[PDB]
């Protein structure tokens, strides 16, 4: 009743909002057997991973909230869809179609919606391409505050880390869920620093979807700074999330290069508290799926206005190898919105900025 992988687990702080879990069934789709237990175990272990990382970074035992209906059992919404499975495929807006239908379901049942974040899980298609040994066919990506992942018969934590086809399949699809959930929880891609890579392994939002459960995987300071400002990690019920627009004035920005060091400083002013500054340094190209390489840093601010100061060591920029690089400054607000400013440089023609 308790898998071995959950025997080591921490008590977590109650949160003001919880991640919704929807098991999304096409009108012609049968659940994968034993999904309530299998997915509860996997989700509770995922919750442990995120909560232990938040604690290790100084935020206390805070994870994404889950609605628990009995010991070891998540309150999963089993949703029977209006249309057959073929109507909500990975491609061509299948995920948006599912999400719109769930918007209708939550409008008609607002008691069952516990936050603005939802993880939708669909069973694998079973055809000539996909099946229990090669899951796929369904949405599998982040979509705003929503994210999509899948289920299949061996999607069971008992295989975690095992040197078997089931174990390798699990790290692929469980690591995948962990990473897509990160996107759903407002996380962009980022890469571990050189020092963190040596101590803690592979960043989950970098290539950690390939390592989760098999080799050491972790969450960066910058990811934890965003989770600190994510609705389902809130221990402050007075705080409302994601309303309005990010309003930050950023002035007197200086970026200077002195030996091996990158100096970043400036001032900020917001009507909201500014929780933190994340700094991302990456090689081109810069699209939202060409940024697995962005090495990230974070600094706590915690005021509505003030100055920021940061020295970044170039030797921590593990993996970067382009003459051209971009520094992004991301200001994270208390309501979970953020704004960014970008600056591009060239190592062979380094120009201090303002
Ligand atoms: Zn991703
Ligand atoms: Zn890049």
Residue numbers in the entry: 27 to 380
The study reports:
Here we focus on OgpA from A. muciniphila, a recently discovered O-glycopeptidase that exclusively hydrolyzes the peptide bond N-terminal to serine or threonine residues substituted with an O-glycan. OgpAWT comprises two domains from the N- to the C-terminus: (i) a catalytic domain (residues 25–262) followed by (ii) a β-sandwich domain (residues 263-385). Interestingly, a Zn2+ atom coordinates with the side chains of three histidine residues, H205, H209, and H215, a highly conserved triad among metalloproteases. A glutamate residue, E206, is well-positioned to act as a general base/acid during catalysis.
The crystal structure of full-length OgpA in its unliganded form was solved using zinc single-wavelength anomalous dispersion (Zn-SAD). The high quality of the electron density maps allowed the trace of residues 27–380 (OgpAWT1) and 25 to 382 (OgpAWT2). The overall protein scaffold and the conformation of the OgpAWT1 and OgpAWT2 were essentially preserved (root mean square deviation, r.m.s.d., of 0.37 Å for 350 residues). However, the connecting loop α4–α5 (loop 9; residues 227–246) is unstructured in OgpAWT2 whereas in OgpAWT1 displays a short α-helix. Furthermore, we were unable to fully model the β7–β8 connecting loop (loop 12; residues 309–320) on OgpAWT2 crystal structure because it is disordered. A close inspection of the two crystal structures revealed that the protein crystallized as a monomer. The first β-sheet of the antiparallel β-sandwich domain consists of four β-strands with topology β6–β7–β8–β11, whereas the second β-sheet comprises four β-strands with topology β13–β12–β9–β10, with an overall size of 39 × 28 × 19 Å (“Methods” section). Both domains are separated by a long and open groove that runs parallel to the protein surface where the active site is located.
